[PDB]
Amino acid sequence: KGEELFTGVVPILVELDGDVNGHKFSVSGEGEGDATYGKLTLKFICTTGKLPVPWPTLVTTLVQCFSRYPDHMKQHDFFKSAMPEGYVQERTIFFKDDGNYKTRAEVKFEGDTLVNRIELKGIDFKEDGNILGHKLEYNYNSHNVYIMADKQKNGIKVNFKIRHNIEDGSVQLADHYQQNTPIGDGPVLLPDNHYLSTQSALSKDPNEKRDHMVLLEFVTAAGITL
Amino acid sequence: QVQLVESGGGLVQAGGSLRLSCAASGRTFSTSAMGWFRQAPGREREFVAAITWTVGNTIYGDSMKGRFTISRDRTKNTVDLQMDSLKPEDTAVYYCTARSRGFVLSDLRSVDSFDYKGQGTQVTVS
């Protein structure tokens, strides 16, 4: 039922209110999602000035309902089955040898637009570390996002590690722990164990003077083998 | 949960105007839309207006489009109903509502599609 809302190109709005080590900031984004190709296209702007953390650290927080689920796997697509009422998405993100983010978000339709509204808090970050020191390269890597059912909470549990490339050639690990639960009480699809192959490419608009990020993503579900 | 407090009712002559207001408190982070409905004694609930929370798109009940305007303030978490060209058939208790579930827009025309409702304020037109 919710899958029918994703057959074409769907407009997207994102809003994030954040606080990291006492530094408050806000981000807004807009673009388009096309689940038949598993494709996202979005542009984000820091509306409060300069972003106090690197843009790559915000990518996972800033709509997995746009993943392409092949035909033989449509029964495992929790994210679309919760639409239009939506779902709550919560994470803790541990940056190894540094602070952590905690996030709470709701993803839902407001008529024709899919909306992702987020609150973010970061604590215990080192003032001269990779995050507050802005030592991350402006890029992104490919990752497998592992998904299993959470029958007791009628949702899913998700985990994965993100590799952030640092300028000096090393990497910074970010360990993601994730839970999703529906907002409505209608029936939802609880998946078998599978994964999302996720790719992300970051760019800049040379016409944009504000602190911003241009983002393209390709996501496809896998792990059943027909 | 969410709590809603309406105000601005009264007794006005036909052709005049009123402005209702509602203050929301509680888990307003989750709000996807707010609206108004009305109930006259003996009669059933009728849909008045709704506004989508992020973008501010508006919809109206058939006898009110043109005369009434719904608006909302996200920093103050309020929603108002300007009522012009009032008629005696607008006499009713007016209730403000809020929704947290997402929706397709036509879901909002259904008067019982809210998640929370306020206490109500009386409007009388003579």
Swiss-Prot record, chain A:
| Impact after mutating T198Y | Gives rise to yellow-emission variants. In EYFP; leads to yellow fluorescence, folds faster and more efficiently at 37 degrees Celsius and has superior solubility and brightness
Effect annotated for changing I162V? In P9; increases fluorescence at 475 nm excitation. In R10-3; matures to the red-emitting state with excitation and emission maxima at 555 and 585 nm, respectively
Please outline how this chain is modified post-translation.
Contains a chromophore consisting of modified amino acid residues. Maturation of the chromophore requires nothing other than molecular oxygen.
Keyword list (alphabetical) reads: Chromophore, Luminescence, Photoprotein
Changing N193S has the effect of: In EBFP1.2; shifts the excitation and emission spectra to shorter wavelengths and increases quantum yields compared to BFP
Annotated consequence of substituting V145I: In Azurite; shifts the excitation and emission spectra to shorter wavelengths and increases quantum yields compared to BFP
On the tree of life, the source organism's domain of life is Eukaryota
Effect of changing F94S: reported as:
In alphaGFP/cycle 3 GFP; improves folding at 37 degrees Celsius, reduces aggregation at high concentrations, and increases the diffusibility of the protein inside cells
Known outcome of mutating N141I: In ECFP; leads to cyan fluorescence, folds faster and more efficiently at 37 degrees Celsius and has superior solubility and brightness
Biotech use, per record:
Green fluorescent protein has been engineered to produce a vast number of variously colored mutants, fusion proteins, and biosensors. Further generation of mutants led to more stable proteins (at 37 degrees Celsius for example) with brighter fluorescence and longer fluorescence lifetimes.
Q: Changing I123V does what?
A: In EBFP2.0; shifts the excitation and emission spectra to shorter wavelengths and increases quantum yields compared to BFP
Q: What is the effect of changing V188A?
A: In mut1.5; shifts fluorescence lifetime from 3.03 to 2.72 ns
Known outcome of mutating E217G: Suppresses the 399 nm excitation peak, leaving only the longer wavelength peak at 475 nm
Outcome of altering S67A? Increases fluorescence at warmer temperatures such as 37 degrees Celsius. In GFPmut 3; highly fluorescent mutant when excited at 488 nm
The record's tissue-specificity note reads: Photocytes.
Annotated consequence of substituting S142P? Increases fluorescence at warmer temperatures such as 37 degrees Celsius
So what family is this one in?
Answer: Belongs to the GFP family.
Task: Tell me the subunit arrangement.
Answer: Monomer.
The protein in question is named Green fluorescent protein
State which gene encodes it: GFP
